[PDB]
């Protein structure tokens, strides 16, 4: 026998098009949406109001009891964050986690900044039903498709229950999942036992309209199953008939603006230390200073606020010249995705809740104990022939560049308008002397960090630009103290392969190649390049301590100053930094915080490089067997472990290329791979895979990647062999296509075309598709302008390419006459003979060589480049690159 429902949906689909205009809305309950779509068209993020309808639903479920919100949400199907975002303004919950799928045709999350942003995190992308079930206090979906075939949403309805049925075993203390079909007989003995398994029952939320029979699954809910479906059923029946009723209105949620209070988990400030730089910031801003209740740190101390004015940008241009003359890849999301980053307060914020407010437990004591040791004989080994010294300030001045940021914060260091202006005001040099007193009778004054996002060219997040990085640095006095007391280590080239055996600091991408071929040549088991997720966000407080070792090797006054500018900035860290907050209105917040390392410090790259070089020579030691299970609890005998050492700690090192954070190394055995309790214990957790799961290596050198790059062996025509830098193409244009620039001219992108252009020509010589666009817009540029910009961050991207030179001439030099892996030192006259790499490389790289839509680009390149020059004016002289 049909249900009352299956005769509902009988009439629904016999109805004409005007019949189902007149019934859709007659009688319903509905928001007002028109004074909320306005403001999210404009952008205003900070107006309180709802993103999507279904928000009001679930208020309408609280209000009533049949929704108890609380602890951790989780919202599958999130949409826009309808759902996501009204969840996080529960005063019970504390995190709410959105997924849903994204691409072409469905709704991407939105980002507001409504009450309680900060615990939201929504990722799209994900397909739910591939997706583990995890633990949560709240499930929440809303996923359904309406069809106009009962046997389709029966068969859409059945396969959602299969999938929530996974979370519901897990036994959420609230939840609220969509059915979309309860009202045939197959599907109401499938809730039949649905409820006698998990309970709850079935809802019909007014604020829907009559066309879609659809009921939530709720857990305040006890209704009889059938009772319920086919009570919904005779309302609906009876709209039908007669008349057409009013549409009751009522009014949107406002669901407010700023942070939320968060629970405080952050370490016990210091204040004998950070003291008196907390006043002397409180003292400045005293006529707006005040406590913020609802900041959103975690794992930081927090020590106030005060009114400031926003900064950065979320805006990405395009470069026109490379756009014109890649017109194949307009198709291609991999190159079209690239824009830069977001660094407004909310911008970096977002990113800074997630990936920098964490806290990782301490290591344990026999694993900080081996720490010890092997940090300890680091430097003894790196100090051989090599001694710590004082740098000068006649150095300091000699290697601030133009954009060397001033970064002052009291009101005396305020005083120049640019660093190398400032570094010759003897007022400057009196800040530092000053400064420096105050160390050597225990106190820090002025140094303090600034905090911010950094401009990045990245792939977007949702439809808009991905959120921004954080760097910190100090200023430029603090700056100077800093280099004077460390900068030994990177001005007398510690690191360098030479002193460390397995550092590569002051290499070029052009020389890095040749340090994997020759790690392939000795023995063992595959490579391995795990990277730690979130390196700088785990440097602990232990290895801090570790990274102090050095003042050991110090005459005994440079242990003073070096021991100040540690104890006083590396250990503590007084940090500004700017907030969204109720309103619109943008906020300086002072922070501190005992670990982590900070981006911008003096000897950043080189300590990490000495921590990650400590921390694979660690993970060798559990590979072969010389520290247990035991030994992470307490360390049984230590001199087990400076005998591994002595006997055979300089050949693993040998083994290793250490570049920052980024590491590859080639083991004894595949061992390697599963020795982790260690890894794991030193809070180096890895990256995108399982905290224990075995690691993944490499059979071919010429595939594993290092600082973003792999490396193939290549032969020059007639002779001789090079190893060359590759990765993939679609990142390399995407860059290249986007303009950092606020408002260019078309000559001041024209230029920034130029280096991305001859810096393909000098590195990637052997993509086929970089070569010839790279001859392209070498062609379309005027000759005699001069390339600006930065085409990379890379530390090993130095810049040979940033000059107006031949390219011919300064390829030569890099390769070959000043190429220490190159014992025939004979020139090459022209650019037929530099190879390309194999066709079958170049497409599993990006390459595009047999499709149609780029062999007509290649045989349009003359005329395309004629056009590309009327744009930059045909005034200009040119050179035919191209032959
Ligand atoms: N298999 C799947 N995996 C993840 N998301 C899916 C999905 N199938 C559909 N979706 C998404 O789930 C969303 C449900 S609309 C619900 C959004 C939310 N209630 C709000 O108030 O905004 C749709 O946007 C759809 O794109
Ligand atoms: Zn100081
Ligand atoms: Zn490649």
Same mark, same amino acid.
């Given at each position: 026998?049909?249900?009352?429902?299956?005769?509902?949906?009988?009439?629904?689909?016999?109805?004409?098009?005007?019949?189902?205009?007149?019934?859709?809305?007659?009688?319903?309950?509905?928001?007002?949406?028109?004074?909320?779509?306005?403001?999210?068209?404009?952008?205003?993020?900070?107006?309180?109001?709802?993103?999507?309808?279904?928000?009001?639903?679930?208020?309408?479920?609280?209000?009533?009891?049949?929704?108890?919100?609380?602890?951790?949400?989780?919202?599958?199907?999130?949409?826009?964050?309808?759902?996501?975002?009204?969840?996080?303004?529960?005063?019970?919950?504390?995190?709410?986690?959105?997924?849903?799928?994204?691409?072409?045709?469905?709704?991407?999350?939105?980002?507001?900044?409504?009450?309680?942003?900060?615990?939201?995190?929504?990722?799209?992308?994900?397909?739910?039903?591939? /997706?583990?079930?995890?633990?949560?206090?709240?499930?929440?979906?809303?996923?359904?498709?309406?069809?106009?075939?009962?046997?389709?949403?029966?068969?859409?309805?059945?396969?959602?229950?299969?999938?929530? $049925?996974?979370?519901?075993?897990?036994?959420?203390?609230?939840?609220?999942?969509?059915?979309?079909?309860?009202?045939?007989?197959?599907?109401?003995?499938?809730?039949?036992?649905?409820?006698?398994?998990?309970?709850?029952?079935?809802?019909?939320?007014?604020?829907?309209?009559?066309?879609?029979?659809?009921?939530?699954?709720?857990?305040?809910?006890?209704?009889?199953?059938?009772?319920?479906?086919?009570?919904?059923?005779?309302?609906?029946?009876?709209?039908?008939?007669?008349?057409?009723?009013?549409?009751?209105?009522?009014?949107?949620?406002?669901?407010?603006?700023?942070?939320?209070?968060?629970?405080?988990?952050?370490?016990?400030?210091?204040?004998?230390?950070?003291?008196?730089?907390?006043?002397?910031?409180?003292?400045?801003?005293?006529?707006?200073?005040?406590?913020?209740?609802?900041?959103?740190?975690?794992?930081?101390?927090?020590?106030?606020?005060?009114?400031?004015?926003?900064?950065?940008?979320?805006?990405?241009?395009?470069?026109?010249?490379?756009?014109?003359?890649?017109?194949?890849?307009?198709?291609?999301?991999?190159?079209?995705?690239?824009?830069?980053?977001?660094?407004?307060?909310?911008?970096?914020?977002?990113?800074?809740?997630?990936?920098?407010?964490?806290?990782?437990? =301490?290591?344990?004591?026999?694993?900080?104990?081996?720490?010890?040791?092997?940090?300890?004989?680091?430097?003894?080994?790196?100090?051989?022939?090599?001694?710590?010294?004082?740098?000068?300030?006649?150095?300091?001045?000699? *290697?601030?560049?133009?954009?060397?940021?001033?970064?002052?914060?009291?009101?005396?260091?305020?005083?120049?308008?640019?660093?190398?202006?400032?570094?010759?005001?003897?007022?400057?040099?009196?800040?530092?002397?000053?400064?420096?007193?105050?160390?050597?009778?225990?106190?820090?004054?002025?140094?303090?960090?600034?905090?911010?996002?950094?401009?990045?060219?990245?792939?977007?997040?949702?439809?808009?630009? *991905?959120?921004?990085?954080?760097?910190?640095?100090?200023?430029?006095?603090?700056?100077?103290?800093?280099?004077?007391?460390?900068?030994?280590?990177?001005?007398?080239?510690?690191?360098?392969?030479?002193?460390?055996?397995?550092?590569?600091?002051?290499?070029?991408?052009?020389?890095?190649?040749?340090?994997?071929?020759?790690?392939?040549?000795?023995?063992?088991?595959?490579?391995?390049?795990?990277?730690?997720?979130?390196?700088?966000?785990?440097?602990?407080?232990?290895?801090?301590?570790?990274?102090?070792?050095?003042?050991?090797?110090?005459?005994?006054?440079?242990?003073?100053?070096?021991?100040?500018?540690?104890?006083?900035?590396?250990?503590?860290?007084?940090?500004?930094?700017?907030?969204?907050?109720?309103?619109?209105?943008?906020?300086?917040?002072?922070?501190?915080?005992?670990?982590?390392?900070?981006?911008?410090?003096?000897?950043?790259?080189?300590?990490?490089?000495?921590?990650?070089?400590?921390?694979?020579?660690?993970?060798?030691?559990?590979?072969?067997?010389?520290?247990?299970?035991?030994?992470?609890?307490?360390?049984?005998?230590?001199?087990?472990?400076?005998?591994?050492?002595?006997?055979?700690?300089?050949?693993?090192?040998?083994?290793?290329?250490?570049?920052?954070?980024?590491?590859?190394?080639?083991?004894?055995?595949?061992?390697?791979?599963?020795?982790?309790?260690?890894?794991?214990?030193?809070?180096?957790?890895?990256?995108?895979?399982?905290?224990?799961?075995?690691?993944? $290596?490499?059979?071919?050198?010429?595939?594993?990647?290092?600082?973003?790059?792999?490396?193939?062996?290549?032969?020059?025509?007639?002779?001789?062999?090079?190893?060359?830098?590759?990765?993939?193409? =679609?990142?390399?244009?995407?860059?290249?296509?986007?303009?950092?620039?606020? $408002?260019?001219?078309?000559?001041?992108?024209?230029?920034?075309?130029?280096?991305?252009?001859? /810096?393909?020509?000098?590195?990637?010589?052997?993509?086929?598709?970089?070569?010839?666009?790279?001859?392209?817009?070498?062609?379309?540029?005027?000759?005699?302008?001069?390339?600006? $910009?930065?085409?990379?961050?890379?530390?090993?991207?130095?810049?040979?390419?940033?000059?107006?030179?031949?390219?011919?001439?300064?390829?030569?030099?890099?390769?070959?006459?000043?190429?220490?892996?190159?014992?025939?030192?004979?020139?090459?006259?022209?650019?037929?003979?530099?190879?390309?790499?194999?066709?079958?490389? =170049?497409?599993?790289?990006?390459?595009?060589?047999?499709?149609?839509?780029?062999?007509?680009?290649?045989?349009?390149?003359?005329?395309?480049?004629?056009?590309?020059?009327?744009?930059?004016?045909?005034?200009?002289?040119?050179?035919?690159?191209?032959?």
């Amino acid at each position: 026998g049909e249900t009352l429902g299956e005769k509902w949906k009988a009439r629904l689909n016999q109805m004409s098009a005007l019949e189902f205009y007149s019934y859709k809305k007659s009688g319903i309950t509905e928001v007002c949406r028109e004074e909320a779509r306005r403001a999210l068209k404009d952008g205003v993020a900070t107006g309180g109001h709802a993103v999507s309808r279904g928000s009001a639903k679930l208020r309408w479920l609280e209000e009533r009891g049949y929704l108890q919100p609380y602890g951790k949400v989780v919202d599958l199907g999130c949409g826009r964050g309808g759902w996501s975002y009204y969840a996080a303004t529960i005063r019970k919950v504390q995190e709410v986690r959105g997924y849903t799928k994204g691409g072409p045709g469905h709704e991407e999350p939105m980002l507001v900044q409504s009450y309680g942003w900060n615990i939201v995190r929504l990722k799209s992308g994900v397909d739910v039903f591939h /997706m583990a079930a995890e633990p949560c206090d709240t499930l929440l979906c809303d996923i359904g498709e309406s069809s106009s075939s009962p046997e389709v949403e029966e068969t859409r309805t059945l396969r959602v229950l299969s999938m929530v $049925g996974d979370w519901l075993e897990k036994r959420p203390g609230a939840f609220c999942i969509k059915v979309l079909c309860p009202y045939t007989s197959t599907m109401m003995e499938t809730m039949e036992r649905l409820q006698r398994r998990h309970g709850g029952g079935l809802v019909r939320v007014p604020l829907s309209r009559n066309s879609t029979h659809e009921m939530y699954w709720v857990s305040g809910a006890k209704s009889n199953i059938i009772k319920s479906v086919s009570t919904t059923s005779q309302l609906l029946l009876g709209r039908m008939d007669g008349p057409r009723r009013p549409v009751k209105y009522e009014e949107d949620v406002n669901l407010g603006s700023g942070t939320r209070a968060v629970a405080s988990c952050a370490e016990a400030p210091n204040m004998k230390i950070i003291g008196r730089r907390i006043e002397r910031i409180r003292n400045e801003h005293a006529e707006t200073w005040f406590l913020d209740e609802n900041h959103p740190y975690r794992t930081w101390a927090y020590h106030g606020s005060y009114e400031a004015p926003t900064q950065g940008s979320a805006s990405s241009l395009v470069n026109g010249v490379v756009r014109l003359l890649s017109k194949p890849w307009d198709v291609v999301t991999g190159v079209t995705g690239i824009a830069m980053t977001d660094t407004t307060p909310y911008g970096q914020q977002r990113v800074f809740k997630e990936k920098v407010d964490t806290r990782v437990p =301490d290591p344990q004591e026999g694993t900080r104990q081996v720490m010890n040791i092997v940090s300890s004989w680091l430097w003894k080994e790196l100090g051989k022939r090599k001694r710590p010294r004082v740098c000068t300030k006649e150095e300091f001045i000699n *290697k601030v560049r133009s954009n060397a940021a001033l970064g002052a914060i009291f009101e005396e260091e305020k005083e120049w308008k640019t660093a190398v202006e400032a570094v010759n005001d003897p007022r400057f040099w009196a800040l530092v002397d000053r400064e420096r007193e105050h160390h050597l009778r225990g106190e820090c004054h002025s140094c303090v960090y600034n905090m911010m996002g950094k401009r990045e060219k990245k792939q977007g997040e949702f439809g808009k630009a *991905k959120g921004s990085r954080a760097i910190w640095y100090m200023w430029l006095g603090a700056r100077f103290l800093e280099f004077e007391a460390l900068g030994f280590l990177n001005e007398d080239h510690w690191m360098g392969r030479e002193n460390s055996g397995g550092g590569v600091e002051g290499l070029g991408l052009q020389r890095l190649g040749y340090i994997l071929e020759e790690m392939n040549r000795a023995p063992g088991g595959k490579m391995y390049a795990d990277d730690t997720a979130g390196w700088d966000t785990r440097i602990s407080k232990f290895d801090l301590e570790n990274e102090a070792l050095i003042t050991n090797q110090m005459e005994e006054g440079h242990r003073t100053l070096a021991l100040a500018v540690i104890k006083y900035t590396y250990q503590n860290k007084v940090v500004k930094v700017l907030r969204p907050a109720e309103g619109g209105k943008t906020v300086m917040d002072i922070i501190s915080r005992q670990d982590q390392r900070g981006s911008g410090q003096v000897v950043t790259y080189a300590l990490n490089t000495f921590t990650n070089l400590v921390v694979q020579l660690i993970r060798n030691m559990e590979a072969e067997e010389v520290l247990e299970m035991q030994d992470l609890w307490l360390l049984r005998k230590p001199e087990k472990v400076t005998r591994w050492l002595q006997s055979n700690g300089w050949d693993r090192l040998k083994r290793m290329a250490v570049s920052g954070d980024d590491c590859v190394v080639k083991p004894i055995d595949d061992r390697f791979a599963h020795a982790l309790r260690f890894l794991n214990d030193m809070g180096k957790v890895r990256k995108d895979t399982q905290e224990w799961k075995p690691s993944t $290596g490499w059979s071919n050198w010429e595939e594993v990647p290092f600082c973003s790059h792999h490396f193939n062996k290549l032969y020059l025509k007639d002779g001789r062999s090079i190893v060359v830098p590759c990765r993939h193409q =679609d990142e390399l244009i995407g860059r290249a296509r986007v303009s950092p620039g606020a $408002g260019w001219s078309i000559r001041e992108t024209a230029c920034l075309a130029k280096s991305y252009a001859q /810096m393909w020509q000098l590195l990637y010589f052997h993509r086929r598709d970089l070569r010839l666009m790279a001859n392209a817009i070498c062609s379309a540029v005027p000759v005699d302008w001069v390339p600006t $910009g930065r085409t990379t961050w890379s530390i090993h991207g130095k810049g040979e390419w940033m000059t107006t030179e031949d390219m011919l001439m300064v390829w030569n030099r890099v390769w070959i006459e000043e190429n220490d892996h190159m014992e025939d030192k004979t020139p090459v006259t022209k650019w037929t003979d530099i190879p390309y790499l194999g066709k079958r490389e =170049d497409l599993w790289c990006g390459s595009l060589i047999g499709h149609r839509p780029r062999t007509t680009w290649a045989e349009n390149i003359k005329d395309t480049v004629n056009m590309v020059r009327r744009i930059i004016g045909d005034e200009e002289k040119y050179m035919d690159y191209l032959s």
